[PDB]
Amino acid sequence: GRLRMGFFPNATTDSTSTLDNAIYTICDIGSDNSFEITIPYSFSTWMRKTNGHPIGLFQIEVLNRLTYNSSSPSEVYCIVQGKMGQDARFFCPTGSVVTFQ
């Protein structure tokens, strides 16, 4: 099956919307079932608050129903990971907003 995951940078309205104009990636199930999507830096400012405005709207819509057979699952599990790009940078160290353990 296929699955299209898009991303509207800097979006705030949490609502399902056509991803035709959003940065999307179509995922066709095969041997390498891990799919990546990059969001390039998008903000008015040169640097952006670490804990400020959202990164954007993340949506993963179904493109083609997950097919199966007598001995295969009718539904599967998915995991979403996140990391910084090779051009990632952090700038000013500020106070803390939370306490770890």
């Binding site: 104009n21 990636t25 999507i37």
Partner: protein
């Protein structure tokens, strides 16, 4: 060895026992047309990942130049592209003779005015992007018969100025890109304004780029017989335009913190 090795043995064994007529058998082994590969295709801000690709097709001896050699449309190929930067009428107003010095004739929200109506060349694209970075080229036109006289102040006011407008001393606005244009002398003013803001990019459909205004330097001195309906028009062109952030159709997106 094996199972790859078979075309050779059969082809050879057939070869060894061959007589005058020749071999009575030929065997060839190779990889299937449908191999275990993965194809990836990327269009504008999109990436299609397929792990079960097939040989792409196309018409006979096709021509993808897509350019009409006959030019049934005699326009620059990049016409549609540059169209949004086209010069357009941003505003029109009729100066009233009674108006005092320093009065604001008319003003235009910058830069969202270029998408003022759905009939604006730039309105189309402006919808699909939340961020904008552009330069302007204004042409404020004011026509008045020779008998009459007067002067207007065409000046560009960045958000900073527009914000604190009342705190600024009129008569000093000449410090901003302006054009004291003396009527009966000039019928049009030209202003080239680059991207000016305290942020790298300005939210589309916003007035953050500041706004162009037209003030009354010296009220209109219209003689008795002379006409009394003077119109002030503001035209705008985009020296350079740049839409970056993608977004839903005309949906308010915050590029700011």
């Amino acid at each position: 060895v094996g199972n790859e090795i078979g075309g050779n043995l059969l082809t050879k064994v057939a070869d060894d026992a061959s007589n005058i007529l020749g071999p009575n058998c030929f065997a060839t082994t190779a990889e299937p047309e449908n191999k275990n590969v993965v194809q990836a295709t990327t269009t504008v801000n999109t990436t299609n990942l397929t792990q079960h690709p097939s040989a792409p097709t196309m018409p006979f001896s096709p021509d993808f130049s897509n350019v009409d050699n006959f030019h049934s449309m005699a326009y620059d190929i990049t016409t549609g592209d540059k169209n949004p930067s086209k010069l357009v009428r941003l505003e029109t107003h009729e100066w009233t003779p009674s108006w005092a010095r320093g009065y604001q004739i008319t003003h235009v929200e910058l830069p969202k005015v270029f998408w003022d109506h759905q009939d604006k060349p730039a309105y189309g694209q402006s919808r699909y992007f939340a961020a904008v970075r552009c330069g302007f080229h204004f042409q404020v036109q004011v026509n008045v018969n020779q008998g009459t006289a007067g002067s207007a102040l065409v000046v560009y006011e960045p958000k900073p100025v527009v914000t604190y407008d009342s705190k600024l001393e009129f008569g000093a606005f000449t410090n901003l890109p302006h054009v004291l244009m003396n009527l009966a002398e000039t019928t049009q003013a030209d202003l080239c304004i680059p991207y000016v803001a305290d942020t790298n990019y300005v939210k589309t459909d916003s007035s953050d780029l500041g706004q162009l205004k037209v003030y009354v330097w010296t009220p209109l001195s219209i003689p008795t017989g002379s006409a009394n309906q003077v119109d002030v028009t503001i035209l705008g062109s985009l020296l350079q335009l740049d839409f970056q952030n993608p977004r839903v159709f005309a949906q308010d997106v915050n590029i700011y913190d």
